[PDB]
Amino acid sequence: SSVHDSLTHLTLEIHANTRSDKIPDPAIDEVSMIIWCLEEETFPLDLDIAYEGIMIVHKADSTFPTKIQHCINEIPVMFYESEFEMFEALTDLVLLLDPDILSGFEIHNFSWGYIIERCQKIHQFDIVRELARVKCSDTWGYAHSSGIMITGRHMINIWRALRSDVNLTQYTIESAAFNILHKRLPHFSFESLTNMWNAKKSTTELKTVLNYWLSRAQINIQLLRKQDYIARNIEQARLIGIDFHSVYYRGSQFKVESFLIRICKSESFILLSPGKKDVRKQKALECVPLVMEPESAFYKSPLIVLDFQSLYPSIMIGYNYCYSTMIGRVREINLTENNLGVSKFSLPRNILALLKNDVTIAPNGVVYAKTSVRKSTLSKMLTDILDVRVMIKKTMTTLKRLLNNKQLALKLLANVTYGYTSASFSGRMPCSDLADSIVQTGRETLEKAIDIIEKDETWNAKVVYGDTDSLFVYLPGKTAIEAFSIGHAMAERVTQNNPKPIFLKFEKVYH
Amino acid sequence: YINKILIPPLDRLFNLIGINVGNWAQEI
Amino acid sequence: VLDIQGNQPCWCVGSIYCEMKYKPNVLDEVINDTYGAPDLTKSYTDKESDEIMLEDESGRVLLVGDFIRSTPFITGVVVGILGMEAEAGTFQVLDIC
Amino acid sequence: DYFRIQLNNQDYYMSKPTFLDPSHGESLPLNQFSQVPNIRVFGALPTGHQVLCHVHGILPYMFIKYDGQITDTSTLRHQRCAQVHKTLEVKIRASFKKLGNLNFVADVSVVKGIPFYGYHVGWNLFYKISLLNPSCLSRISELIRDGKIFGKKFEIYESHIPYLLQWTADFNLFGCSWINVDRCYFRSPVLNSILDIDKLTINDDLQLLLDRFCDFKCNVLSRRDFPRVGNGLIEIDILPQFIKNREKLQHRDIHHDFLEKLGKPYVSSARDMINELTMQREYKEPPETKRHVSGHQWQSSGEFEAFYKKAQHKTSTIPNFENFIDKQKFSAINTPYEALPQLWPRLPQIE
DNA sequence: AATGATAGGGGAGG
DNA sequence: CCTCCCCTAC
Numbered sequence A: 001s002s003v004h005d006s007l008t009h010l011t012l013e014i015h016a017n018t019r020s021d022k023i024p025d026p027a028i029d030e031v032s033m034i035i036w037c038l039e040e041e042t043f044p045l046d047l048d049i050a051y052e053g054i055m056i057v058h059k060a061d062s063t064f065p066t067k068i069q070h071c072i073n074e075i076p077v078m079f080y081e082s083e084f085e086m087f088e089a090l091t092d093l094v095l096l097l098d099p100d101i102l103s104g105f106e107i108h109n110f111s112w113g114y115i116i117e118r119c120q121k122i123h124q125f126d127i128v129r130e131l132a133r134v135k136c137s138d139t140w141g142y143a144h145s146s147g148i149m150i151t152g153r154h155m156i157n158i159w160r161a162l163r164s165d166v167n168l169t170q171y172t173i174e175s176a177a178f179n180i181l182h183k184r185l186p187h188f189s190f191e192s193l194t195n196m197w198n199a200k201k202s203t204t205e206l207k208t209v210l211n212y213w214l215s216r217a218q219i220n221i222q223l224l225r226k227q228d229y230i231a232r233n234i235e236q237a238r239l240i241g242i243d244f245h246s247v248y249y250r251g252s253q254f255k256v257e258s259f260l261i262r263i264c265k266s267e268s269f270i271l272l273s274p275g276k277k278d279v280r281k282q283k284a285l286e287c288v289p290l291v292m293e294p295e296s297a298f299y300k301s302p303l304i305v306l307d308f309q310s311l312y313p314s315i316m317i318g319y320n321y322c323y324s325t326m327i328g329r330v331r332e333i334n335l336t337e338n339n340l341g342v343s344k345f346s347l348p349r350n351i352l353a354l355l356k357n358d359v360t361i362a363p364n365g366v367v368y369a370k371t372s373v374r375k376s377t378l379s380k381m382l383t384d385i386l387d388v389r390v391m392i393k394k395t396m397t398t399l400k401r402l403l404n405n406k407q408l409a410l411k412l413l414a415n416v417t418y419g420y421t422s423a424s425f426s427g428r429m430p431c432s433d434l435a436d437s438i439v440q441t442g443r444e445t446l447e448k449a450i451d452i453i454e455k456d457e458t459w460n461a462k463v464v465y466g467d468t469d470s471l472f473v474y475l476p477g478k479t480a481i482e483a484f485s486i487g488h489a490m491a492e493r494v495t496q497n498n499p500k501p502i503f504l505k506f507e508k509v510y511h
Numbered sequence B: 001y002i003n004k005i006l007i008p009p010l011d012r013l014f015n016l017i018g019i020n021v022g023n024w025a026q027e028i
Numbered sequence C: 001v002l003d004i005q006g007n008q009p010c011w012c013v014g015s016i017y018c019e020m021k022y023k024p025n026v027l028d029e030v031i032n033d034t035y036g037a038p039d040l041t042k043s044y045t046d047k048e049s050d051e052i053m054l055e056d057e058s059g060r061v062l063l064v065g066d067f068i069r070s071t072p073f074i075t076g077v078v079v080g081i082l083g084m085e086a087e088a089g090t091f092q093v094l095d096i097c
Numbered sequence D: 001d002y003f004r005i006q007l008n009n010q011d012y013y014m015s016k017p018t019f020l021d022p023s024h025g026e027s028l029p030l031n032q033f034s035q036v037p038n039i040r041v042f043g044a045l046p047t048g049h050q051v052l053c054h055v056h057g058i059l060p061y062m063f064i065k066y067d068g069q070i071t072d073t074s075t076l077r078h079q080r081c082a083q084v085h086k087t088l089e090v091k092i093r094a095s096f097k098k099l100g101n102l103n104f105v106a107d108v109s110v111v112k113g114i115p116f117y118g119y120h121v122g123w124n125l126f127y128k129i130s131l132l133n134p135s136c137l138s139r140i141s142e143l144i145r146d147g148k149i150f151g152k153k154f155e156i157y158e159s160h161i162p163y164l165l166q167w168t169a170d171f172n173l174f175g176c177s178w179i180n181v182d183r184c185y186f187r188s189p190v191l192n193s194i195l196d197i198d199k200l201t202i203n204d205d206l207q208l209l210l211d212r213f214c215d216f217k218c219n220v221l222s223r224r225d226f227p228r229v230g231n232g233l234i235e236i237d238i239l240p241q242f243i244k245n246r247e248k249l250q251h252r253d254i255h256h257d258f259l260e261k262l263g264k265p266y267v268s269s270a271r272d273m274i275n276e277l278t279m280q281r282e283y284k285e286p287p288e289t290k291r292h293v294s295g296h297q298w299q300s301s302g303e304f305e306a307f308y309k310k311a312q313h314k315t316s317t318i319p320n321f322e323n324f325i326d327k328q329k330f331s332a333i334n335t336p337y338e339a340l341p342q343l344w345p346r347l348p349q350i351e
Numbered sequence E: 001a002a003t004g005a006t007a008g009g010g011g012a013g014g
Numbered sequence F: 001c002c003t004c005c006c007c008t009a010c
């Protein structure tokens, strides 16, 4: 077909016989079944592999493989005398397909982790060094990600990905399948599975366990596909520019650093790298967001909800707030030594007099250069990402999915951008003054909006609740049909009293 | 279960109106 | 069942395996009175069939032919199939006991 | 017409300097390098064939403040770079437990730049300390910042950015994107015969690509010097000159003076996205006429204005836009994006 | 080994 | 009143 612009995906599952409800331990209980599923939609080269397979240990009596073959009759099954040969065959299969991602459900104490532990502890075989694409500890890795590190290939823990994606009580294969794929799967205890697997007769039981594990393996691909996790992560990586591993393993500051270094490298900018001690000894944050306690009561009349769109990004775009735009705190401006966050510097001789007009003092008290002398870099980044997001949203099946993935990635990047500042702890390039300015001017904008809304006599409305950018205005007995017009009018009035990127949206009402 | 799972949240929601849910539960 | 392999007639005794899916009306009736019954039609559509096997505690073989078609069968019923293997693990049917 | 490899995964390792790697530097050319870093790229061809790529000549670097004066005659800069290189090498060798076979620092060079943490308008001189082992770069930065190396503490620039991120950003690379390269070097037999993959994976398109890019006469490296290390299909070795993803970057130097005050997206990924959307299909968005305040007056604006007037009266000694910054040509000093082409070894041929 | 800020509320236990 | 823990809003 067309060119290959996706990542190959392979999933694996393990069945191990337990011993009277002991949750099979990877040191006493051996592997028996390595049912694996390979994603077909994104796999090129059209090779005869059938995209599916089952591996079963059989010492070899003379009827078990034949019975299994007839009861399956669809997927080829390979039988091995020992689990070491079965592991070697699995390694050969991985080296043949050479998948980009090896995944599974709860891969720490199960299939991938179980195989790794069995190979390392019992057989003294380093399966990790053999499954890599190169011939020749991670507490954070196991905390909220996959702790397995195989060279070349990415390990994806499906349950963690779904936990980060969808919020629901409990996280099991059955619950996820029912709440995502609308499939109900019977669940059998380990003792029962061992009993069916140890029954020489009753082909029905063998077919039952085989279909059990086959469905468990197959449903993983559908779960990752319906949420479109792989494609969304690939699109986000292409947008930000970080590798596929850093999309989910690294933190939010990594993406912001990537954008910043990519933008600044074209403008001959040199980024400062403060130490941990410098960040620890910097001035603490003083400005806090404005939240008002609502009047706890039941509101019969319609309640219009107003919410600013990207309040902080719009603030930084409009007010030109950046690292390269701070001149200094308006109080205590010395020509010898100053203080701005984690750095000290000295102003030139006649800098203030030269730019006495093209500056804008922040609410916190920090002088910022106007756009007429220097356009800030963060404003450039935020306006570019916002323009791209609104363009793709305005344009908006495959193209629709790609546009949705791009929209989500752009929203995530824009939201994480502000978090780069105000990083008092575990911050690699923080700036207390910039974050304080942003929060304070957000508070001022909120107060101005509230005053404008309350001032109008024709709108006998009063603000009852307030958040970082949320306004709850109450219209006592105001026939909600016309409440939409009033809400649109106040949104337009508030918008027309702010710089260009600042915008207010009505978007809903509570009768 | 009744008291310590339903009385607190229903009381938080309905004390704004001005009614005590616990009185309703007392009669049963 | 695994001993019937060759170009010679042979007979064996085993139970009959069939599909026997439920009728949709029964499924609707049991779903409407369970309060949480899943989409049981998915259990029949996922598999997506028309064949008869012979299970005798050692495996199954497909009962192809015409004598086996013109007889209603229910799963779990044992019979005395007497036929000949022709070209695969499929067993022909000539007489039934 | 370009060899295209997707950025699926990346890693780095230390190897001995071959004829495809830099062996010396400009500060201390006499002393060679004990080891050099190499970046491994795990990618797949557009036809679907996995390719392993080794990247040579890419070195991590960090910037520290230049101590000398801007009135150098292009000769004292080299001497100062040599002295600081020797001091760094000695101090790291002593702390980490005749000076030859450099193991930590490759070379030190002087590059211009504009600081980012604050408002700066003029060119500032910086050192470019290129290291050999990127893993210990954080340790070197900590030692320099803590005053263990020199007699005074020095601020560190561009040390929180990892080596892989620097390499990707310098050459205009994005994750899961094509690495458009025109020339490559092949290794031990291209169609690997691990078990049988030299027959199943091969197709017409793969053979056409090999015929277009592989010559088997002056392209395949020697078997003895460069054995395969990848358990996959065809493996290539690349040089920094070969990567043509760069040269599409728009370099601007408008921040060295008040160019803006006198008479297209800034992210190339966004440019690619909008190009794709235009190819898929005009686009417009009518704005709203906003009449803001005269100066957006706030509660504590008067005190701020008074303090600004006091500060302006304090630091003053009539400045003009065209005559504020001093007009030091700084033509000899290399631009940061004009400095990474340095240290690229050669265009060798050892066939 | 890696981690972006701040603000509110409830519940158990001592 | 105190700390500890859960976890949702922005």
Ligand SMILES: Nc1ccn([C@H]2C[C@H](O)[C@@H](COP(=O)(O)OP(=O)(O)OP(=O)(O)O)O2)c(=O)n1
Binding pocket: A307, A308, A309, A310, A311, A312, A313, A415, A418, A419, A468, A469, F010
């Ligand atoms: N995880 C978060 C969520 C929000 N905010 C801050 C940034 C916003 O400027 C402000 C408002 O948050 P919103 O939830 O309203 O999101 P936005 O206003 O930024 O965009 P949108 O309105 O489209 O949701 O709160 C933050 O710092 N971190």
Ligand SMILES: [Ca+2]
Binding pocket: A307, A308, A309, A310, A311, A469
């Ligand atoms: Ca909002």
